[PDB]
Design a protein around this ligand. Structure first.
Ligand SMILES: C[As](C)(=O)[O-]
Length: 316
């Protein structure tokens, strides 16, 4: 089942309780939150909803201290484990050692992960609850063609030991992935059917491998980079994907509806490189978030804040 990211940065959003109800109502059994909001945590009790619990980047620093991490796990994890199906903890989101926004935090990620996981195992929850981190693909320097997929040379010192850690505790890697921005930046080279999963024939040829949609190509591009960095056994959970209804080039209702509907359907299966396993995927995001900037980041909602659906999707 597809999951949905619950961002709460709007001035017009439903009460937490109604949002959970709406999740249950729409039969959405998977959620991603970006911080451990207690009301949300208390609201998920007995929901049977598998949860991605996020560590906010501002606390990464704090958690490089083992004791801060311990108390972090006690308050937010052990206090709820009876009734909340914590699935993954996403320690940091879109951290890069070379992106201006997050560079000074990179040092913190792996230690945080060890302390939380260390904290996690002491409570004996390590086979249910996988410690990981959620990346963006700014870290991937090459993805064309997909077989050539490789991480940026200047991010290898950062990613390498993180991969190693993940391999050893058998955790997957989490990736936020937006075919939308790939398309939006280069519609001359990227065809909309390619971006939207509606292409009858392959669009990208990779030796003997043909890519029909932008989403399949990119993940496999990620897979090739993981394989070159000693993560050939890592699973990828896709922790964000979405298409905006307004605010910029190609931000339209129809595109949104197409993209998201094929996607929900697509991930019932895999990619041209790893056909067996289903892609665990989290749709971004449940509500428009009128506080985000710029304009287009306020329209990723799948639902209006009055809780009527934007796109009329089956999540079942
Ligand atoms: C834009 As190209 C030549 O890397 O497919």
């Amino acid at each position: 089942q597809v999951g949905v990211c619950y961002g709460m940065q709007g001035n017009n959003l439903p009460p937490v309780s109604e949002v959970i109800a709406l999740y249950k109502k729409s039969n959405i059994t998977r959620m991603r939150i970006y911080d451990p909001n207690q009301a949300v945590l208390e609201a998920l009790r007995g929901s049977n909803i598998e949860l991605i619990l996020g560590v906010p980047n501002s606390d990464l620093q704090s958690l490089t201290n083992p004791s801060n991490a311990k108390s972090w796990v006690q308050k937010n994890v052990r206090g709820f484990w009876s009734s909340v199906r914590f699935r993954y903890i996403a320690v940091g989101n879109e951290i890069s050692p070379v992106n201006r926004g997050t560079a000074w935090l990179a040092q913190f990620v792996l230690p945080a992960m060890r302390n939380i996981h260390d904290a996690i195992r002491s409570a004996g929850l390590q086979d249910q609850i996988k410690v990981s981190t959620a990346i963006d693909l700014t870290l991937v320097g090459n993805s064309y063609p997909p077989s050539a997929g490789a991480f940026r040379d200047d991010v290898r010192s950062y990613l390498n030991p993180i991969i190693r850690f993940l391999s050893s505790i058998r955790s997957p890697l989490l990736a936020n992935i937006y075919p939308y921005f790939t398309y939006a930046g280069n519609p001359r080279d990227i065809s909309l059917p390619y971006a939207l999963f509606t292409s009858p024939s392959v669009v990208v040829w990779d030796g003997q491998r043909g890519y029909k949609n932008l989403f399949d190509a990119t993940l496999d591009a990620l897979y090739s980079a993981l394989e070159r960095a000693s993560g050939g056994s890592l699973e990828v959970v896709v922790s964000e994907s979405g298409w905006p209804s307004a605010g910029a080039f190609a931000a339209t209702f129809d595109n949104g509806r197409t993209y998201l509907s094929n996607l929900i359907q697509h991930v019932k299966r895999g990619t041209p490189k790893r056909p067996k396993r289903a892609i665990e995927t989290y749709l971004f995001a449940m509500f428009d978030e009128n506080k985000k900037q710029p304009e287009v980041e306020k329209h990723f909602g799948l639902f209006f804040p009055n809780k009527w659906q934007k796109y009329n999707l089956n999540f079942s």
